[PDB]
Amino acid sequence: NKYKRIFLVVMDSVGIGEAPDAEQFGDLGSDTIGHIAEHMNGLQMPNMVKLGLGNIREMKGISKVEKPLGYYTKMQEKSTGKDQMTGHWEIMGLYIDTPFQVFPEGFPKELLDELEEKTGRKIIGNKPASGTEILDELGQEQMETGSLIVYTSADSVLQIAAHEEVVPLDELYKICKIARELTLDEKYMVGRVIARPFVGEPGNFTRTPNRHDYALKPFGRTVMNELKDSDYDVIAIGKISDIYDGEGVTESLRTKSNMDGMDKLVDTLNMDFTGLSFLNLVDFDALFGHRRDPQGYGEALQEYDARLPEVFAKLKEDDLLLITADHGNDPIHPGTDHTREYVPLLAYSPSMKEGGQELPLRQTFADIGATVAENFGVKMPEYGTSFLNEL
Ligand SMILES: O=P([O-])(O)O[C@H]1O[C@H](COP(=O)(O)O)[C@@H](O)[C@H](O)[C@H]1O
Ligand SMILES: [Mn+2]
Ligand SMILES: [Mn+2]
Ligand SMILES: [Mn+2]
Numbered sequence: 001n002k003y004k005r006i007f008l009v010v011m012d013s014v015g016i017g018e019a020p021d022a023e024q025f026g027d028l029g030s031d032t033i034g035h036i037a038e039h040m041n042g043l044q045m046p047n048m049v050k051l052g053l054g055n056i057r058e059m060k061g062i063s064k065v066e067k068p069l070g071y072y073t074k075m076q077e078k079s080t081g082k083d084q085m086t087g088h089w090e091i092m093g094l095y096i097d098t099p100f101q102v103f104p105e106g107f108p109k110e111l112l113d114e115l116e117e118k119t120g121r122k123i124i125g126n127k128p129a130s131g132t133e134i135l136d137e138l139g140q141e142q143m144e145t146g147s148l149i150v151y152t153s154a155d156s157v158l159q160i161a162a163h164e165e166v167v168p169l170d171e172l173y174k175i176c177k178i179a180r181e182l183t184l185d186e187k188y189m190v191g192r193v194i195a196r197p198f199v200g201e202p203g204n205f206t207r208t209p210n211r212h213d214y215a216l217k218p219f220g221r222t223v224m225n226e227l228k229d230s231d232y233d234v235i236a237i238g239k240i241s242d243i244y245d246g247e248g249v250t251e252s253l254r255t256k257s258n259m260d261g262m263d264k265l266v267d268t269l270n271m272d273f274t275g276l277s278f279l280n281l282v283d284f285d286a287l288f289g290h291r292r293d294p295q296g297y298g299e300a301l302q303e304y305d306a307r308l309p310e311v312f313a314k315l316k317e318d319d320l321l322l323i324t325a326d327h328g329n330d331p332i333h334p335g336t337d338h339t340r341e342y343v344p345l346l347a348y349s350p351s352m353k354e355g356g357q358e359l360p361l362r363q364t365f366a367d368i369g370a371t372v373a374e375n376f377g378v379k380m381p382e383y384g385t386s387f388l389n390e391l
Contacts (some may be wrong), residue, residue: 001274001375001376001377002318002320002375002388002391003318003319003320003349003375004274004316004318004319005273005274005275005276005277005316005318005319005320006275006276006277006319006320006321006322006372006375007265007268007269007277007279007311007315007319007320007321007322008276008277008278008279008322008324008368008372009265009279009281009321009322009323009324010088010091010240010278010279010280010281010324010325010326011281011284011304011323011324011325012084012239012280012281012282012283012284012285012286012325012326013032013284013285013289013325013326013327013328013329013338014032014033014284014301014325014328014343014344015030015031015032015033015325015327015328015329015330015339015341015342015343016031016032016033016034016056016057016074016325016328016341016342016343016344017030017031017033017034017057017341017342018030018031018328018339018340018341018342019076019077019340019341019342020076021340022339022340022341024340025082025339025340026334026335027082027328027333027339027340027341029333030328030330030333030339030340030341031328031330031341032289032297032328032329032330032331032339032341033057033059033062033301033344034057034059034060035294035330035331035332035333036294036297036298036301036331036332037059037060037061037062037298038059038060039294039295039298039331039332040060040061040294040295040298040302041060041061042060042061042062043059043060043061043062043298043301043302044061044302044305045061045062045301045302045305046305047305047306047308047309047312048062048305048308048323048346049062049063049065050065050068050069051068051069051070051072051308051323051346051348052064052065052068052069052070052071052072052346052356053072053344053346055068055072055358056072056073056074056344056345056346057074057344067354067355068355068356068357069312069348069352069355069356070321070346070347070348070349070352070355070356071346071347071348071352071356071357071358071359071387071390071391072344072345072346072347072356072358072359073345073358073359073360073361073362074342074343074344074345074361074362075324075342075343075344075345075361075362075364075365075367075368076342076361076362076363076364077090077327077340077343077364077365078090078095078363078364078365078366078383079094079095079096079097079099079364079365080096080097080098080099081096081098081099081100082099082327082328082337082338082339082340083099083100083101083102083155083156083191083327083338084100084155084156084191084243084285084326084327085100085156085191085216085218085243086099086100086327087325087326087327087365088240088243088244088280088326089218089219089220089222089244090364090365090366090383091324091326091365091366091368091369092218092222092223092224092244092248092366092368092369092381093220093222093223093366093369093370093373093381093382093383093384094218094219094220094222094366094369094381094382094383095364095366095382095383096219098186098189098219099189100156100189100190100191101156101188101189101190102152102154102155102156102337103128103152103158103190104128104335104336104337105127106125106126106127106128106152107126107150107152107158107188108187108188110187111182111183111185111187111188112126112150114182115148115150115175115178115179115182118178118182119148119175119178121146121147121148121175122145122146122147122148123147123148123150124138124141124142124145124147124148124149124150125137125138125149125150125151126150126151127151127152128151128152128153128154128336129151129152129153130153131151131159131161131196131198131207134149134151134161135149135161135198135205135207136203136205139161139163139198139200139202139205140202142161142162142163142166143163143166143202146166146167148160148161148162148167148175149161149162149196152190153290154290154336154337155191155192155290156189156190156191156192157190157191157192157193157194158179158183158190158192158193158194159193159194159196160172160175160176160179160193160194160195160196161196161197161198161207162175162196162197162198163197163198163199163205164197164198164199164208164210165199167197169197169210172195172197173195173212176193176194176195176212176214177214179193179214180193180214184216191215191216192213192214192215192242193213193214194211194212194213194214195210195211195212195213195214196211197210197211213242215242215243215245216245217244217245217247218244218245218247220382221247222244222247222248222369222381223248223369223370223372223373223378223381224244224247224248224249224276224278225247225248226248226373226378226379227248227275227276227372227376227378228248228249228250229248229378230376230377230378232250232274232275232276232376232378233250233251233273233274233275233276233277234248234249234250234251234275234276234278235250235251235252235253235268235271235273235275235276235277235278236249236251236252236253236278237252237253237255237261237264237265237268237277237278237279237280238253238254238255238261238264238279238280238281238282239280239282240252240278240279240280243280250275253267253268257283258281258282258283258284258300258303258304259303259307261279261280261281261282262281262304262307262311264279265277265279265311266310266311266314269311269314269315269319270314275376276372281304283300284297284300284301284329285329285338287300288300288331289329289330289331289338290329290336291331292331292332292333292336293331294331294332296331297331312348312350315348315349315350316350317349317350317351318349318351319349319350320347320348320349320375320391321346321347321348321349322345322346322347322368322371323344323345323346323348324343324344324345324346324365324368325343325344326343326365327339327340327341327343328340328341328343343365345359345362345368347359347387347391349391352391356391357390359387359390360387362385362387363385364383364384364385365384366381366383366384367384367385367386367387368384369381369383369384370383370384370385370386371384371386371387371388373386374386374388375388
């Protein structure tokens with residue numbers, strides 16, 4: 001095998017400019033890194049610059065270098081949707097025709113009617129909200145009536161909140177499983193159904209750790225599945241395991257923040273493994289993109305960049321580092337949804353003694369999965385073209 005270990009880092013939502021099909025999505029003008037760079041009066045990301053970020057595209061504070069450490073290009077999304085599961089499933093070798101939906105005005109009456117019909121319970125709420133806001137507003141009514149608080153967020157989720165002393169946990173989980181079946185429908189396709197049990201009294205409600213998530217499996221066996229089946233390590237860091245519903249995962253490391261995610265990446269550098277370490281840095285999307293906070297996003301990018309030199313120092317001759325993103329989420333863009341954007345691709349190994357070069361543009365995110373598959377000699381994905389031989 002060419003590389004013993006591959007470290008794949010998804011900077012979640014870190015897009016590099018509108019894709020050719022952005023107009024279909026209402027995403028003309030979208031530019032996640034570029035708009036952040038402008039807001040920051042120049043982004044400080046010297047380590048990404050050294051890798052060749054500016055060679056992909058020059059932006060404020062992000063300039064090209066004569067001799068990038070590794071290889072660079074961008075990738076274009078081939079699948080229909082710009083959601084979390086589409087982008088990640090494509091990266092690992094799939095093609096997803098049917099996109100996951102978001103619900104800024106709440107769920108269609110038809111879906112909620114059927115959920116009521118199957119459960120024998122009333123549904124209240126039906127809007128995007130934080131768990132705190134919705135409990136303050138409807139927690140007391142929920143307790144008194146035994147109704148279900150159904151709500152969403154900026155991502156593809158259907159959340160069901162019920163008080164633990166009013167709706168037994170087991171009943172709440174049964175209800176969520178019913179909701180999970182009903183939402184396997186392209187009209188209502190949510191990425192995740194989430195049980196949100198809570199306790200307390202009006203003016204003092206708290207969500208309990210008895211939260212359960214109900215995800216869909218990827219629409220195909222992924223490169224991760226093939227790695228696991230061939231006895232390779234597949235270490236998932238952060239949201240990765242959840243995003244693939246555990247498919248192909250041999251070890252999962254939970255993270256609490258981007259800095260904690262980098263700490264776990266460092267932990268995996270310290271592990272003797274053969275296979276894939278796969279990190280998702282989610283704060284970019286979860287705290288800043290959807291909340292349209294370019295300052296916070298910019299600060300987070302600078303915090304991430306400052307962590308990289310330690311990563312560079314630990315990489316071995318037979319390690320490969322891949323840095324990419326799944327979609328965009330431009331923090332200076334209308335609405336609260338993701339943006340359809342190209343994503344950067346940086347590919348670096350200390351064995352690249354003369355530095356890297358420009359790669360042909362990746363026509364699908366599955367090019368990453370294809371590269372990983374070829375490296376480890378496992379079954380090649382149906383989609384994607386390996387760039388292993390170019391490195
Ligand atoms: O908590 P996480 O990282 O699993 O994230 C979870 O909860 C968030 C809601 O946050 P709130 O608690 O403010 O309602 C949602 O945006 C997200 O889709 C969901 O996976
Ligand atoms: Mn848009
Ligand atoms: Mn994402
Ligand atoms: Mn998102």
